[PDB]
Amino acid sequence: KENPMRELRIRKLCLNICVGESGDRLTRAAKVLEQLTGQTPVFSKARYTVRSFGIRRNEKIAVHCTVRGAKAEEILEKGLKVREYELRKNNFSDTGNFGFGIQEHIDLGIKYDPSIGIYGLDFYVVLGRPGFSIADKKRRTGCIGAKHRISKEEAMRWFQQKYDGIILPG
């Protein structure tokens, strides 16, 4: 009934880890993303100086990576397994894309190394349909259109159908 070009699918998984300050902590956090994603992470500087958070401007504060393709799908199932395939409905967003956070990186895949820290990580998957790339395109870029957009309700079905997930009322 539905067109094959309307099928929902994962655009990117967008792992992010934010630490307080630049230092060995950030470098070891970068290795944490590198081992999980098999991919070189990128550091993010602080936009402003905040004395309360003890961060200075243009200081490396966080490390983040974007994972696409089958690699993203395999990372998502590990993280969902940490949350026992149970996502709260507030986590799903109005734009049609959801995210969850994992407190401990060590539990899934990677053995703890004494050099490596105890860092957790942040998941935010972006859900898309075929043809969403027209917005990114340089030539003749355009908006996707209302019917082709993904709603919060559609994302919730996708989790409930693909991962037999449970959306708790929270």
Place this chain on the structure above:
RNA sequence: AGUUUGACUGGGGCGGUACACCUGUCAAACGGUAACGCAGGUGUCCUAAGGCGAGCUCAGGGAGGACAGAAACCUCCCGUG
């Protein structure tokens, strides 16, 4: 001993600089147009903040995401500036 001891100025002095400049206004829809008219600014700064090319999009807001809270970072959407 010789000489000098600025100017403008609702008298002079004191105070200010309207004494060389720049923006808006006055200013009466070309331009020009005065008051010690009004609101301000200048004696600098920059091997890049100069010159090309390329690639991006900004302020702000909404919705999401471990520690994270009104603000740390990540993601999507709106966004004529």
